[PDB]
Tab-separated table of N, CA and C and ligand atoms in Angstrom:
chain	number	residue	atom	x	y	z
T	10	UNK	N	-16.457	33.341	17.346
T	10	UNK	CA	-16.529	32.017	16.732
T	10	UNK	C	-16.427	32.081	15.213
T	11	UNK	N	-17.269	32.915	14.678
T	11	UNK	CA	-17.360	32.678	13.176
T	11	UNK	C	-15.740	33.608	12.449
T	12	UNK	N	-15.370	34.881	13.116
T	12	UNK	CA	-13.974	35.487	13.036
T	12	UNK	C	-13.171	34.483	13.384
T	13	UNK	N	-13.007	33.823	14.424
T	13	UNK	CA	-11.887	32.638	14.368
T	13	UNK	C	-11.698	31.423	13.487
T	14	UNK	N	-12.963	30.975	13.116
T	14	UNK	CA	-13.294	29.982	11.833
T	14	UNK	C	-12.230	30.563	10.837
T	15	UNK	N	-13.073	31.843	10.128
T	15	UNK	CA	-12.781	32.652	9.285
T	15	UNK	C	-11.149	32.560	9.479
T	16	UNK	N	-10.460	32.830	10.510
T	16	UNK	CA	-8.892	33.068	10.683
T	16	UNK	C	-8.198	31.714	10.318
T	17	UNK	N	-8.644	30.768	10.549
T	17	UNK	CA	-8.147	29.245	10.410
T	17	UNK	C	-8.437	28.830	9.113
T	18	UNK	N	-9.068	28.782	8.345
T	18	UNK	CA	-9.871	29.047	7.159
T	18	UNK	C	-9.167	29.316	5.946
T	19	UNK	N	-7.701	29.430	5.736
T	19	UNK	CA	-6.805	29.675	5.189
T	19	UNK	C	-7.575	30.508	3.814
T	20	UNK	N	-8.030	29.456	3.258
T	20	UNK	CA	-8.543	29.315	1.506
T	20	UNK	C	-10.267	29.810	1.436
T	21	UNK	N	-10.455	29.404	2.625
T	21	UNK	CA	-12.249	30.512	2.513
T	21	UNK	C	-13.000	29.253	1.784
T	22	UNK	N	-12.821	28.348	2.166
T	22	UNK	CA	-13.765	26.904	1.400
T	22	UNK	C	-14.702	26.450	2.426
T	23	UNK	N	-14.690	26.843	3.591
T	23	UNK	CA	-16.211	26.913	4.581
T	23	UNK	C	-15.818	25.564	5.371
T	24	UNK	N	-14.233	25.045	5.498
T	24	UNK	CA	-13.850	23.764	5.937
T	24	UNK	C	-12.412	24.484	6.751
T	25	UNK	N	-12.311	23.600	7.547
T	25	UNK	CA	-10.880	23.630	8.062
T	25	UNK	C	-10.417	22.481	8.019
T	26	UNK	N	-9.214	22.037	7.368
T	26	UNK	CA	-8.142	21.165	6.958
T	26	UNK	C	-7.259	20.614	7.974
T	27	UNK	N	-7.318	19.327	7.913
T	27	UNK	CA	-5.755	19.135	9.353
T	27	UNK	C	-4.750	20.125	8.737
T	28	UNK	N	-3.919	20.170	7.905
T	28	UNK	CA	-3.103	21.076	7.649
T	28	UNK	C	-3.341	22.252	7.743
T	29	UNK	N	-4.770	23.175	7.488
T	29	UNK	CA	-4.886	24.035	8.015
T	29	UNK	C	-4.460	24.418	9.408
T	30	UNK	N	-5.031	23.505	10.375
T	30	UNK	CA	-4.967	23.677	11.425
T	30	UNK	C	-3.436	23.313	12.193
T	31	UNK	N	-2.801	22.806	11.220
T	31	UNK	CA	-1.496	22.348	11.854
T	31	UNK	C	-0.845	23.501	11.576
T	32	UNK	N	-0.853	24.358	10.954
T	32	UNK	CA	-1.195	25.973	10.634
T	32	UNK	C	-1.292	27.208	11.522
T	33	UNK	N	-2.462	26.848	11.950
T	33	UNK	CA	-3.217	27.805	13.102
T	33	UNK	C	-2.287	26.994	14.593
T	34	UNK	N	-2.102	25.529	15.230
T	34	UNK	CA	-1.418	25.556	16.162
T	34	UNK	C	0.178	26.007	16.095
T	35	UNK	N	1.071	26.037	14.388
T	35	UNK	CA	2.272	26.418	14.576
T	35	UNK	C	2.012	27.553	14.912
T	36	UNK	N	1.887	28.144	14.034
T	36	UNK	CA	1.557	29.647	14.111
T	36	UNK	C	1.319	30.685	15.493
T	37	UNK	N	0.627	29.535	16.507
T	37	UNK	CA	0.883	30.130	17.997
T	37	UNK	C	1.534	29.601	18.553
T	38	UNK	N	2.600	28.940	18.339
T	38	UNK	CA	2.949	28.020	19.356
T	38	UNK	C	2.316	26.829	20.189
T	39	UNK	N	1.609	26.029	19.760
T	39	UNK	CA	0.990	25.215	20.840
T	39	UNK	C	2.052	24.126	21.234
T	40	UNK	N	2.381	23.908	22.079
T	40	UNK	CA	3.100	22.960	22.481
T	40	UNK	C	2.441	20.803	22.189
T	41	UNK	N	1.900	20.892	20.967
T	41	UNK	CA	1.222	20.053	20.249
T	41	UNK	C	2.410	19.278	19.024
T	42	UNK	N	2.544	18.183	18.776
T	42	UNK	CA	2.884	17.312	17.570
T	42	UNK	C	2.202	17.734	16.790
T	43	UNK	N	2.567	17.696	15.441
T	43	UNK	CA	1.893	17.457	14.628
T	43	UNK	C	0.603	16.354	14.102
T	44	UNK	N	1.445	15.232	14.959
T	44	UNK	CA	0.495	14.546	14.775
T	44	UNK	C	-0.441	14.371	15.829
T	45	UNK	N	-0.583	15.425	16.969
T	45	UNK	CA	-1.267	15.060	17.966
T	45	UNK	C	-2.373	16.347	17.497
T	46	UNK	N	-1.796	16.993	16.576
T	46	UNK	CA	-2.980	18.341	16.018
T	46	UNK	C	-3.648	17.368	15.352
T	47	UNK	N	-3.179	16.296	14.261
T	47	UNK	CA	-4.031	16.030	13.525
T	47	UNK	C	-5.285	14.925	14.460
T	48	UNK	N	-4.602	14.230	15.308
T	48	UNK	CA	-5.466	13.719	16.307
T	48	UNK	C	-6.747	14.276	16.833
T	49	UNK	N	-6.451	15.883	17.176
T	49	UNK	CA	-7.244	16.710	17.448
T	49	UNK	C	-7.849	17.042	16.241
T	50	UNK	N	-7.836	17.289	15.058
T	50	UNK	CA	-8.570	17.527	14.229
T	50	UNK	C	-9.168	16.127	13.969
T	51	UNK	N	-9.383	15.028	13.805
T	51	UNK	CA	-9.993	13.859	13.232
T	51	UNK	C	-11.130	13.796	14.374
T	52	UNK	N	-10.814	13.972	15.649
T	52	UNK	CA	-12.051	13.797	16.629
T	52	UNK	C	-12.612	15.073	16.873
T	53	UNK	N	-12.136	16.236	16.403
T	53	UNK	CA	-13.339	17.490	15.995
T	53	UNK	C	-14.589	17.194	14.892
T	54	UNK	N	-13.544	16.316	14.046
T	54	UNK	CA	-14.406	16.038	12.485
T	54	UNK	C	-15.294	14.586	12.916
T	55	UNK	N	-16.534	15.364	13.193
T	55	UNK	CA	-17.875	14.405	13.874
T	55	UNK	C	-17.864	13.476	12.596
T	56	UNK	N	-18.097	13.862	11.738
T	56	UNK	CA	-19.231	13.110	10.298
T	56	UNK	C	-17.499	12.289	9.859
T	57	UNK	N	-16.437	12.427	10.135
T	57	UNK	CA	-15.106	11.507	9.315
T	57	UNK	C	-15.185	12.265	8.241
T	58	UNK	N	-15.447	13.058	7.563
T	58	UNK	CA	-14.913	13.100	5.972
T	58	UNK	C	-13.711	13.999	5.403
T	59	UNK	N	-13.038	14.389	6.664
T	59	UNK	CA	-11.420	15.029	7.235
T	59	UNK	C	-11.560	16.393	6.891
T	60	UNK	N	-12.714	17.291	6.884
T	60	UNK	CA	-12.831	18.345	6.933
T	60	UNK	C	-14.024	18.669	8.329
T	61	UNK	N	-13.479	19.970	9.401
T	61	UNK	CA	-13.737	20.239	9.874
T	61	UNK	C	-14.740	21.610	9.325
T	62	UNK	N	-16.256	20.903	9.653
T	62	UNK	CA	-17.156	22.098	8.768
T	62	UNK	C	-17.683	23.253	10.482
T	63	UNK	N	-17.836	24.458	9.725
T	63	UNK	CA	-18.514	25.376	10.916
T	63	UNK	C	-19.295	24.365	12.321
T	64	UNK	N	-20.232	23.752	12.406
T	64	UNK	CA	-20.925	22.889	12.968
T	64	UNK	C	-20.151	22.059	14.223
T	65	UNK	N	-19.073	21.755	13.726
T	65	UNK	CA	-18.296	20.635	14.144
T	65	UNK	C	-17.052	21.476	14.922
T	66	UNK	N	-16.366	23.179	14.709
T	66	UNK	CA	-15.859	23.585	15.451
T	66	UNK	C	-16.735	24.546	16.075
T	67	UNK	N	-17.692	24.386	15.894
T	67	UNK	CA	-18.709	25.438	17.580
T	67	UNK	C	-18.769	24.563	18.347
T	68	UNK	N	-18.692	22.787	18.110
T	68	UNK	CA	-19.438	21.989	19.062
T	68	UNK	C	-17.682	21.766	19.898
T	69	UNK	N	-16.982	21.555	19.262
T	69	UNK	CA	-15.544	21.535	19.488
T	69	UNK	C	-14.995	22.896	20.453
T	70	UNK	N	-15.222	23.745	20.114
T	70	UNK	CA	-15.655	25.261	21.318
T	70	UNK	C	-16.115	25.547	22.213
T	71	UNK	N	-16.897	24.391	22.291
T	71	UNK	CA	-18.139	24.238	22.948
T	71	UNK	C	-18.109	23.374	23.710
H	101	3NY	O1	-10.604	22.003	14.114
H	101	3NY	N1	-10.212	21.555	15.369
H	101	3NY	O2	-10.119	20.406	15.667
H	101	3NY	C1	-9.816	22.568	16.319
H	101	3NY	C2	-9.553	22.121	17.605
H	101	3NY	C3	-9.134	23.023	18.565
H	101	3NY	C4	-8.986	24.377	18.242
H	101	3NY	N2	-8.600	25.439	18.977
H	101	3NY	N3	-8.596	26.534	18.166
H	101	3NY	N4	-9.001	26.137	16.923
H	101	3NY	C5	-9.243	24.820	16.962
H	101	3NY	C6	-9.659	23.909	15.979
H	102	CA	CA1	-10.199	25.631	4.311
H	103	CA	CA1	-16.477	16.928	8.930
Protein backbone atom coordinates (compact mmCIF):
# COMPACT_ATOMS: atom_id res chain seq x y z
CA UNK A 1 0.00 0.00 0.00
CA UNK A 2 2.31 2.68 1.11
CA UNK A 3 5.13 1.38 -2.02
CA UNK A 4 2.23 1.75 -4.41
CA UNK A 5 1.14 5.28 -3.08
CA UNK A 6 4.78 6.07 -3.20
CA UNK A 7 4.81 4.70 -7.12
CA UNK A 8 1.78 6.93 -8.17
CA UNK A 9 3.12 9.79 -6.26
CA UNK A 10 4.99 11.18 -9.13
CA UNK A 11 6.40 14.49 -7.20
CA UNK A 12 6.51 12.97 -3.48
CA UNK A 13 3.86 15.78 -2.20
CA UNK A 14 1.97 13.03 0.03
CA UNK A 15 -1.16 13.54 -2.67
CA UNK A 16 -2.06 11.83 -5.77
CA UNK A 17 -3.30 14.08 -8.63
CA UNK A 18 -6.01 13.12 -11.32
CA UNK A 19 -3.21 13.60 -13.69
CA UNK A 20 -1.07 11.72 -11.69
CA UNK A 21 -3.14 9.00 -11.86
CA UNK A 22 -4.13 9.36 -15.45
CA UNK A 23 -0.39 8.52 -15.37
CA UNK A 24 -0.32 5.44 -13.36
CA UNK A 25 -3.62 4.01 -15.53
CA UNK A 26 -1.68 4.96 -19.03
CA UNK A 27 1.23 3.67 -18.02
CA UNK A 28 -0.44 0.09 -17.55
CA UNK A 29 -2.72 0.05 -19.87
CA UNK A 30 -6.08 0.22 -18.25
CA UNK A 31 -8.62 0.02 -20.64
CA UNK A 32 -10.13 3.42 -18.87
CA UNK A 33 -10.91 7.15 -20.59
CA UNK A 34 -9.37 9.57 -19.40
CA UNK A 35 -12.06 10.95 -18.26
CA UNK A 36 -13.46 7.94 -16.67
CA UNK A 37 -9.84 7.87 -14.57
CA UNK A 38 -10.63 11.19 -13.56
CA UNK A 39 -14.18 10.00 -12.50
CA UNK A 40 -12.41 7.46 -10.55
CA UNK A 41 -10.19 9.76 -8.96
CA UNK A 42 -12.94 12.51 -7.79
CA UNK A 43 -14.96 9.62 -5.97
CA UNK A 44 -11.63 8.22 -4.34
CA UNK A 45 -11.16 11.96 -3.17
CA UNK A 46 -13.63 11.59 0.05
CA UNK A 47 -13.03 15.30 1.52
CA UNK A 48 -13.45 17.02 -2.65
CA UNK A 49 -10.35 19.05 -2.50
CA UNK A 50 -9.00 17.00 -5.89
CA UNK A 51 -6.17 15.52 -4.19
CA UNK A 52 -6.18 12.02 -3.32
CA UNK A 53 -4.38 11.95 0.30
CA UNK A 54 -2.85 8.40 1.79
CA UNK A 55 -6.27 7.92 3.85
CA UNK A 56 -8.52 8.11 0.97
CA UNK A 57 -6.43 5.49 -1.29
CA UNK A 58 -6.26 2.68 1.57
CA UNK A 59 -10.03 3.20 1.91
CA UNK A 60 -10.23 3.11 -2.03
CA UNK A 61 -8.02 -0.39 -1.72
CA UNK A 62 -9.99 -1.28 0.56
O1 LIG B 1 -6.54 7.51 -6.56
N1 LIG B 1 -7.53 6.68 -7.07
O2 LIG B 1 -8.65 7.02 -7.27
C1 LIG B 1 -7.12 5.34 -7.44
C2 LIG B 1 -8.13 4.48 -7.82
C3 LIG B 1 -7.82 3.20 -8.22
C4 LIG B 1 -6.49 2.77 -8.23
N2 LIG B 1 -5.92 1.59 -8.58
N3 LIG B 1 -4.57 1.72 -8.44
N4 LIG B 1 -4.31 2.98 -7.99
C5 LIG B 1 -5.48 3.63 -7.86
C6 LIG B 1 -5.79 4.94 -7.46
CA1 LIG C 1 1.65 14.00 -6.04
CA1 LIG D 1 -8.79 14.51 -0.81
Amino acid sequence: LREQFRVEDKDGNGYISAAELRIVMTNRGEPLTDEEVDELHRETDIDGDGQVNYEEFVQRMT
